[PDB]
Amino acid sequence: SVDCQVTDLAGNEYDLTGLSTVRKPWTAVDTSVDGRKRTFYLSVCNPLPYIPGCQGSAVGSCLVSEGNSWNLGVVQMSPQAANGSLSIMYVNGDKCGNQRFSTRITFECAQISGSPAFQLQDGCEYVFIWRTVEACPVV
Protein backbone atom coordinates (compact mmCIF):
# COMPACT_ATOMS: atom_id res chain seq x y z
CA SER A 1 0.00 0.00 0.00
CA VAL A 2 2.82 2.45 -0.74
CA ASP A 3 2.54 5.11 -3.43
CA CYS A 4 4.98 4.60 -6.31
CA GLN A 5 4.62 8.25 -7.42
CA VAL A 6 6.83 11.00 -6.00
CA THR A 7 7.51 14.64 -6.89
CA ASP A 8 10.92 15.97 -5.92
CA LEU A 9 11.52 19.46 -4.56
CA ALA A 10 12.37 20.66 -8.08
CA GLY A 11 9.04 19.38 -9.44
CA ASN A 12 10.21 16.31 -11.36
CA GLU A 13 7.60 13.55 -11.22
CA TYR A 14 8.77 9.95 -10.80
CA ASP A 15 6.49 6.98 -11.47
CA LEU A 16 7.61 3.50 -10.43
CA THR A 17 4.26 1.70 -10.77
CA GLY A 18 5.63 0.07 -13.93
CA LEU A 19 8.11 -1.73 -11.67
CA SER A 20 5.40 -2.93 -9.26
CA THR A 21 5.06 -6.70 -8.89
CA VAL A 22 1.55 -7.98 -9.60
CA ARG A 23 2.24 -11.71 -10.07
CA LYS A 24 5.97 -12.46 -9.84
CA PRO A 25 8.79 -10.52 -8.17
CA TRP A 26 11.94 -9.05 -9.64
CA THR A 27 15.10 -11.15 -9.67
CA ALA A 28 18.32 -9.30 -8.96
CA VAL A 29 21.31 -9.62 -11.25
CA ASP A 30 24.21 -10.73 -9.06
CA THR A 31 27.68 -11.32 -10.51
CA SER A 32 29.43 -11.29 -7.14
CA VAL A 33 31.42 -14.28 -5.95
CA ASP A 34 29.16 -14.54 -2.89
CA GLY A 35 26.25 -14.76 -5.34
CA ARG A 36 26.94 -18.36 -6.37
CA LYS A 37 24.27 -19.81 -4.06
CA ARG A 38 22.18 -16.69 -3.31
CA THR A 39 19.16 -15.15 -5.05
CA PHE A 40 17.78 -11.72 -4.16
CA TYR A 41 14.06 -11.16 -4.72
CA LEU A 42 12.78 -7.59 -4.86
CA SER A 43 9.56 -5.62 -5.21
CA VAL A 44 8.89 -1.91 -5.66
CA CYS A 45 6.30 -0.22 -3.41
CA ASN A 46 4.35 -3.46 -3.21
CA PRO A 47 5.29 -6.32 -0.89
CA LEU A 48 6.73 -9.49 -2.36
CA PRO A 49 4.37 -12.30 -3.37
CA TYR A 50 4.55 -15.49 -1.32
CA ILE A 51 8.18 -16.64 -1.15
CA PRO A 52 8.77 -19.60 1.21
CA GLY A 53 10.55 -18.42 4.34
CA CYS A 54 9.94 -14.66 4.23
CA GLN A 55 6.16 -14.48 4.70
CA GLY A 56 4.41 -12.36 7.33
CA SER A 57 6.03 -8.92 7.26
CA ALA A 58 5.16 -7.23 3.93
CA VAL A 59 8.67 -8.13 2.83
CA GLY A 60 10.08 -6.04 0.00
CA SER A 61 13.42 -7.85 -0.24
CA CYS A 62 14.10 -11.56 0.31
CA LEU A 63 17.45 -13.36 0.17
CA VAL A 64 17.00 -17.06 -0.69
CA SER A 65 20.07 -19.27 -0.35
CA GLU A 66 20.44 -23.02 0.30
CA GLY A 67 16.92 -23.58 1.59
CA ASN A 68 16.97 -20.71 4.09
CA SER A 69 15.27 -17.36 3.52
CA TRP A 70 16.06 -13.96 5.05
CA ASN A 71 13.82 -10.91 5.21
CA LEU A 72 16.00 -7.95 4.16
CA GLY A 73 13.46 -5.18 4.81
CA VAL A 74 9.77 -4.31 4.60
CA VAL A 75 7.98 -1.82 2.34
CA GLN A 76 7.13 1.30 4.34
CA MET A 77 8.56 4.46 2.78
CA SER A 78 7.86 5.54 -0.79
CA PRO A 79 10.73 6.03 -3.26
CA GLN A 80 12.81 8.99 -2.09
CA ALA A 81 14.03 11.60 -4.55
CA ALA A 82 15.43 14.01 -1.92
CA ASN A 83 19.64 16.45 -6.37
CA GLY A 84 17.32 14.27 -8.46
CA SER A 85 18.47 10.67 -7.84
CA LEU A 86 15.93 8.06 -6.77
CA SER A 87 16.28 5.72 -3.81
CA ILE A 88 13.97 3.31 -2.03
CA MET A 89 14.75 1.89 1.41
CA TYR A 90 13.47 -1.29 3.03
CA VAL A 91 14.55 -1.71 6.65
CA ASN A 92 13.68 -3.75 9.75
CA GLY A 93 14.21 -7.17 8.21
CA ASP A 94 15.50 -10.25 9.97
CA LYS A 95 17.98 -9.86 12.81
CA CYS A 96 21.51 -8.93 11.71
CA GLY A 97 23.86 -8.71 14.67
CA ASN A 98 22.52 -5.99 16.95
CA GLN A 99 20.58 -4.45 14.03
CA ARG A 100 18.17 -5.73 11.38
CA PHE A 101 18.81 -6.28 7.69
CA SER A 102 17.96 -3.48 5.27
CA THR A 103 17.84 -3.12 1.50
CA ARG A 104 18.62 -0.01 -0.55
CA ILE A 105 17.82 0.24 -4.26
CA THR A 106 19.49 3.20 -5.97
CA PHE A 107 17.81 4.12 -9.26
CA GLU A 108 19.52 5.76 -12.21
CA CYS A 109 17.81 7.28 -15.23
CA ALA A 110 18.94 5.18 -18.18
CA GLN A 111 17.30 4.83 -21.59
CA ILE A 112 16.81 1.07 -21.21
CA SER A 113 14.48 -1.37 -19.46
CA GLY A 114 16.83 -2.51 -16.72
CA SER A 115 16.76 -5.04 -13.91
CA PRO A 116 18.08 -4.40 -10.38
CA ALA A 117 21.62 -5.60 -9.77
CA PHE A 118 23.34 -6.42 -6.51
CA GLN A 119 25.97 -3.75 -5.87
CA LEU A 120 27.14 -3.85 -2.28
CA GLN A 121 26.72 -5.27 1.20
CA ASP A 122 27.32 -2.45 3.68
CA GLY A 123 27.30 -4.36 6.96
CA CYS A 124 23.62 -5.17 7.41
CA GLU A 125 22.48 -3.16 4.36
CA TYR A 126 22.18 -4.73 0.91
CA VAL A 127 22.66 -2.10 -1.80
CA PHE A 128 21.19 -2.48 -5.28
CA ILE A 129 21.68 -0.44 -8.45
CA TRP A 130 18.74 -0.19 -10.87
CA ARG A 131 19.50 1.52 -14.19
CA THR A 132 16.18 1.72 -16.02
CA VAL A 133 13.91 4.07 -17.94
CA GLU A 134 11.35 4.21 -15.13
CA ALA A 135 13.90 6.05 -12.95
CA CYS A 136 13.52 9.07 -15.29
CA PRO A 137 11.25 12.09 -14.73
CA VAL A 138 7.69 11.60 -15.95
CA VAL A 139 5.84 14.17 -18.05
Chain residues binding Cl ion by CB under 5 A are 22-23
Hey, CA dihedral for 89, 91, 94, 98, is it positive or negative?
positive
23 vs 36, beta carbon nearer Cl ion: 23
Dist CA 130 CA 86 (whole Å): 10
Query: Using CA atoms, how far apart are residues 73 and 90, in angstroms rounded to an integer?
Result: 4
Closest contact distance (angstroms) between CB of 25 and Cl ion is: 8
Nearer to Cl ion by Cβ, of 23 and 37: the residue is 23
In this complex, which beta carbon is closest to Cl ion, that of residue 43 or of residue 102? 43
Question: Smallest distance from the beta carbon of 26 to Cl ion, in angstroms?
Answer: 9
Task: Return the number of the residue (26 or 107) whose C-beta is nearest Cl ion.
Answer: 26
To Cl ion, the closest distance from the beta carbon of 114 in angstroms equals 16
Q: Smallest distance, Å, CB 85 to Cl ion? A: 26
Instruction: Closer to Cl ion by CB, 5 or 17: give it.
Output: 17
CB of residue 106 to Cl ion, shortest distance in Å = 22
